[PDB]
Amino acid sequence: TLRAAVFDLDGVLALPAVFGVLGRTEEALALPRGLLNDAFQKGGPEGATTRLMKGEITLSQWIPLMECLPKNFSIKEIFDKAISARKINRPMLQAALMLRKKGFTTAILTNTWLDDRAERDGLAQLMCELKMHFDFLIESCQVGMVKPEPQIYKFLLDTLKASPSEVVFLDDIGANLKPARDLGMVTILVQDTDTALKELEKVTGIQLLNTPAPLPTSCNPSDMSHGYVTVKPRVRLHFVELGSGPAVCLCHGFPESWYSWRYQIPALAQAGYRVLAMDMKGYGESSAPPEIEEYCMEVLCKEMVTFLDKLGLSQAVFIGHDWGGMLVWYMALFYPERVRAVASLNTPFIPANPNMSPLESIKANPVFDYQLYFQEPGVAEAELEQNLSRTFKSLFRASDESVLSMHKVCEAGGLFVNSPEEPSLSRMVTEEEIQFYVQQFKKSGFRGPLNWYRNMERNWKWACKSLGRKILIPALMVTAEKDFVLVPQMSQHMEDWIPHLKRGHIEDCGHWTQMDKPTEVNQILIKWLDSDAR
Amino acid sequence: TLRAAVFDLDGVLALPAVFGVLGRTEEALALPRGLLNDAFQKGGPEGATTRLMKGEITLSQWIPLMECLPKNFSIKEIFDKAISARKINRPMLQAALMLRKKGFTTAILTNTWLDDRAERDGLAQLMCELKMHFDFLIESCQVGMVKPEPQIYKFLLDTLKASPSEVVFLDDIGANLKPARDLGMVTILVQDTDTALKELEKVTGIQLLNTPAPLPTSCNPSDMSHGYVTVKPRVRLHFVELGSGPAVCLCHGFPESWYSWRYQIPALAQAGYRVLAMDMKGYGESSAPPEIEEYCMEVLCKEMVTFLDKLGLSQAVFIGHDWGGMLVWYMALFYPERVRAVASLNTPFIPANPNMSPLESIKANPVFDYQLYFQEPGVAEAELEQNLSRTFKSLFRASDESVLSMHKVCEAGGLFVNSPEEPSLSRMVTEEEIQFYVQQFKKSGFRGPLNWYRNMERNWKWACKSLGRKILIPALMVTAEKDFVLVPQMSQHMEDWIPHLKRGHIEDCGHWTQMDKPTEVNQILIKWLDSDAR
Numbered sequence A, B: 001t002l003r004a005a006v007f008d009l010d011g012v013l014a015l016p017a018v019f020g021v022l023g024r025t026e027e028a029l030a031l032p033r034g035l036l037n038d039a040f041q042k043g044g045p046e047g048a049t050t051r052l053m054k055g056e057i058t059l060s061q062w063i064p065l066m067e068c069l070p071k072n073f074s075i076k077e078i079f080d081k082a083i084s085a086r087k088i089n090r091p092m093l094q095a096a097l098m099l100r101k102k103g104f105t106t107a108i109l110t111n112t113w114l115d116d117r118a119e120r121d122g123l124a125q126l127m128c129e130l131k132m133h134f135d136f137l138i139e140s141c142q143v144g145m146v147k148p149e150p151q152i153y154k155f156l157l158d159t160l161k162a163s164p165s166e167v168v169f170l171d172d173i174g175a176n177l178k179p180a181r182d183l184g185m186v187t188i189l190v191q192d193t194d195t196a197l198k199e200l201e202k203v204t205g206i207q208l209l210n211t212p213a214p215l216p217t218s219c220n221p222s223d224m225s226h227g228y229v230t231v232k233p234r235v236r237l238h239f240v241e242l243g244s245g246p247a248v249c250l251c252h253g254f255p256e257s258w259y260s261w262r263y264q265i266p267a268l269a270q271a272g273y274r275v276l277a278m279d280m281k282g283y284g285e286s287s288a289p290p291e292i293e294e295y296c297m298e299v300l301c302k303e304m305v306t307f308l309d310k311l312g313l314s315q316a317v318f319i320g321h322d323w324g325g326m327l328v329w330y331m332a333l334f335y336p337e338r339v340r341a342v343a344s345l346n347t348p349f350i351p352a353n354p355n356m357s358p359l360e361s362i363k364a365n366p367v368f369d370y371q372l373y374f375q376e377p378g379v380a381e382a383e384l385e386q387n388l389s390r391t392f393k394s395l396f397r398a399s400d401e402s403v404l405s406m407h408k409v410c411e412a413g414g415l416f417v418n419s420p421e422e423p424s425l426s427r428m429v430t431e432e433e434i435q436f437y438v439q440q441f442k443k444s445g446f447r448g449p450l451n452w453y454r455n456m457e458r459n460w461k462w463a464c465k466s467l468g469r470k471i472l473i474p475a476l477m478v479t480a481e482k483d484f485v486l487v488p489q490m491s492q493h494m495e496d497w498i499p500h501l502k503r504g505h506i507e508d509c510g511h512w513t514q515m516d517k518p519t520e521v522n523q524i525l526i527k528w529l530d531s532d533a534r
């Protein structure tokens, strides 16, 4: 019985193989077969390459291997092209990801070097992306041992804390497979990925090939960088930070958390962006003052500006969902100099009606009756705080899983009057994911979050000041087909106020866009960021 | 008697003035005098410009002002050049900085616009740099009021919480000065900065002109973004983060804090870098496990790699001082792919002697006898923790202020045997700055920090593995003339191991480089970052 899987980097987790080059260089440059790729191996265990793979010398020290050849011949150039062409073998990583999800201890065992080239970042980025998905990364140059030497396999077994018979070992080199096999490990010679995965599938008894498209990488709260900024005495804002590049500020809706962006955080960071996933004022680890006025759009926007000020950021791309989407449009209208680009999921931009009170506007639409239920302080707090597990299980559901109506809420006397005491677990969320929201809401409750709805008149007066303005900065509107509150049609006239507005649309998607359709959200956002936000 | 100072942005805190352009455009393009600059003012209070300055419309909406002129004529281009040429009037900001340090309430009052141009970041950066140095920033487009209207001055007075006679008002426009003067405020017509400062000097009774060069901007701990990363169960690393751009990781020495970089943090962020000022393992808000082995170079370096991994950073420029400088050279030798560039202040790179034990090496040099005193667990902790204020006041001193010898420490039985109970406050530190270090050291004490010295044999064995390597990545060595422990001569042979090594040297500088000579440190580091780290 097996509980561990070991993968080689080159020719297994990363394709094309490092030595696929050479074979290609010799052929292309019409050089004698094997000359290059044998001069590279010169001296064997006492040679320059073994010293490099053991970490005795760096790649730049090794470049002068050194060793008729033409004028336009460079080992540096051949190796730069080879390392840069090498991309993650996605089906292989997907299989490793599946085995780990199924309880396996996963590891990368590779014959690698200490890269000190000017272009070393390319490989550093690749290793950073791969290493996060595995329990261990064993590099020859770090341990001072190499494949095929028997010592590295005994080291591998020690790190895994497993007997040889409990381990699968995948490698593209037969010589490096042999010591694993002779110790009693299950081995796979990797030629084409498909047959290697068929062999891995048969041995583990787990479906790896032709499996449904997996969900994007999520976040483990304890493995994140948590940031804290005091925006004013007694008001501190919490955020989760990941990646380098242009700052992308993610703003959640009601009754959410930074965790609502769990599928977007790794994806956007990987796309070349510095992600700042907020816990909005009144939520999670951010401060939750009791006063209603502390949650009016003007104060919330001013505090987001202070957040940028204190972090030393002149600009950030503002991506919002729900109430976050609303704030995000107001950041673009009142502080365009601080907004690099603006994007909203579900929340349209509707200019304020100066001739109609917001209470008149809300009463005119029956979908918005829950907003009137949210007006009286204490009422909705009591219902929502009564049973936190019930609250999140009832709300966080796909379009087909609906349990709550949202209509006639005030007349019925609550959101959960037609709802079960023990709602079933939605396909979008795990029990553990629900419990995270439960734990975050135990700190401050629903007073702060609900206060976002208690400034209708205040927000209306402030928004009326921007009635003569137009949003001329890069903007994106993402509509969700099955959002029965924030309907795609509500966005129809936005081009009148945002002429250069770009659009995205997600079919079979409910209100909880980020967790309902994570892959589609990431795809739309990355495409727009790369084209409009740099 | 005065306690408040108000400055205009244009033609006062920022030069050249916005309208210096036009006068220059008309002249250069041989257009009728005033045509441009009057068509701009068309309609007066009901005109397009007043609507813009009140925040009714954006700058891009205003561009089509609109209004024989040539083919190669563009208001967008004229305004882009004008805004980009405008730089901070450093002597004016320096004067504002002096008044605020002397107890004054400072404010910026400006007739400005909502900038939504593609090049809006330039101005956003300028405002971000200026606003941090003032109590208030009053923008016409945010308040819906403009200069010269009497309402903005009553608003100014309200925000300042001061009577007119307590306020100095500086402006380059006579019309906008008049309402402040007629209310009873002291006013200054700003033409040339020197006479304006002479007038400001006479009225306040504070020296503003020809004052000694001020210290760089420092950090107020409560105004910083504090980050926290768990590198392994029970080990969390704390850092202060400021700025955008390439990640610059600052590593302090013994017995320091992230705060030792207080003068570098704002400067490097302003230079276009993302500063991550660490609380090294065993210090401040970072975890301090008791075990000695937790502080060996191999573990500390591995944890710094995990820190980059969890933050989603493939690379960071590593700048270290003292023990931080040592770690930083080992990051370059063992993880070159994760180090964009490497810089050390005072700490030279000396390869390990494989034929001599580190205890033999330490005994051979009498300057290093304190390291032998630091060996026995509990001994140095007791002396250093006895009186924290005394510990920091005795250590943090300039080359001329020496109170401790560091020689014959073991024979004398301590670092402070020749030291006073109440040492005088060094010129480098304030009482408040000393108290910050006192408060940070109250959490974990000196066990963790001292354990950095308790791995001599372990560190020696690990360093011996890198003896065949060379540092080929961008590197900088900064020597301090009067550091009597980390002498500039100790660095003499570094070119043998780091061939492309760049150098910096600071005269009349002791061991505490960052606080001794902050201006010179910032200048050397920024110059090197911009040339070698991108």
Ligand SMILES: OC1(c2cc(-c3ccccc3)[nH]n2)CCCC1
Residues within 6 Å of the ligand: A253, A254, A255, A322, A323, A325, A326, A347, A370, A395, A485, A486, A511
């Ligand atoms: O959070 C809900 C919600 C979301 C909004 C909203 C308010 C303003 C703008 C956008 C959305 N209002 N209400 C969805 C589930 C139950 C209430």
Ligand SMILES: OC1(c2cc(-c3ccccc3)[nH]n2)CCCC1
Residues within 6 Å of the ligand: B253, B254, B255, B322, B323, B325, B326, B347, B370, B395, B485, B486, B511
């Ligand atoms: O912190 C001190 C110190 C600094 C170092 C050091 C150790 C290793 C490398 C560089 C410096 N060893 N000791 C300076 C004041 C009292 C001790």
